[PDB]
């Protein structure tokens, strides 16, 4: 649930140009994985959001020379 | 660094009676993995701390019906 989802997420990050993992947090009790993404542009972040949405449950939101994305996955 | 260390950590958690992962956080920039452990007792948390210390760099500290451990790994 954690280890296997992490590999999938890392694959999508790695496959997606213009994206880096900035931070990641996991809460066992909520079985929730919170991800903060750095992106070169809004276009790159949308590339990533829809790839993540294709594999997992949900779009990536928020956003803050400096674009960030927030994907809370639940399982 | 993240994916491979996670599997090692999960092995030690799983091998150690009386321990559960409560939360986990990773900061890419510090290449730092923060772990919060729930334990049945101080004895279980010491069992875990020394296993983690054997594989990684550092002892697990803090502590807070409710014992917790904090292992910040750096890589």
| Spatial distance between the Cα atoms of B32 and B47, rounded to a whole number of angstroms | 22
Sheet order of strands, B32-39 included = A67-74, A32-39, A19-27, B19-27, B32-39, B67-74
Whether the CB-CB separation of B49 and B58 falls below 8 Å is answered with: no
Closest CA in chain B for residue A29? B22
Query: Which residues does B47 contact at the CB level (< 8 Å), separation at least 6?
Result: B16, B17, B18, B19
Experimental method used, please?
Answer: X-ray
Tokens of B38: 């729930």
Chain B closest CA to A62's CA: distance in Å? Answer: 19
Contact A27/B26, CB-based, under 8 Å?
no
B27 chain-A contacts, CB cut-off 8 A: 23
Tokens of A31: 């079985």
Question: Residue A43, SS3?
Answer: helix
Question: Residue A15, SS3?
Answer: helix
Chain A closest CA to B43's CA: distance in Å? Answer: 22
Q: Touching check for A26 and chain B: CB below 8 Å? A: yes
Give me the phi and psi of A71, to 5 degrees please.
-115, 110
Residues in chain A: 75
Chain B closest CA to A43's CA: distance in Å? Answer: 22
B20 chain-A contacts, CB cut-off 8 A: 28
| Spatial distance between the Cα atoms of A35 and A21, rounded to a whole number of angstroms | 7
> What's chain B look like in SS3?
CCHHHHHHHHHHHHHCCCEEEEEEEEECCCCEEEEEEEECCHHHHHHHHHHHHHHCCCCCECCCCCEEEEEEEEC
Query: What residue segments make up the domains of chain B, in order of their start?
Result: 1-75
Tokens of A29: 């009790």
Tokens of B46: 């010491």
- Partners of residue B67 on adjacent β-strands: B39
Query: Which residues does A75 contact at the CB level (< 8 Å), separation at least 6?
Result: A1, A5, A31, A32, A33
How far, rounded to the nearest angstrom, does the alpha carbon of residue B72 sit from its chain's CA centroid?
8
As a whole number of Å, the CA-based R_g of chain A is: 11
């Amino acid at each position: 649930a954690l280890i296997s989802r992490l590999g999938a997420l890392q694959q999508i990050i790695d496959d997606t140009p213009g994206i880096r993992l900035r931070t990641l947090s996991f809460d066992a009790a909520r079985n929730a994985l919170q991800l903060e993404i750095s992106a070169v542009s809004s276009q790159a972040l949308e590339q990533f959001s829809q790839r993540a949405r294709a594999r997992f449950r949900v779009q990536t939101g928020e956003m803050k020379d400096g674009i960030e994305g927030r994907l809370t996955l639940e399982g």
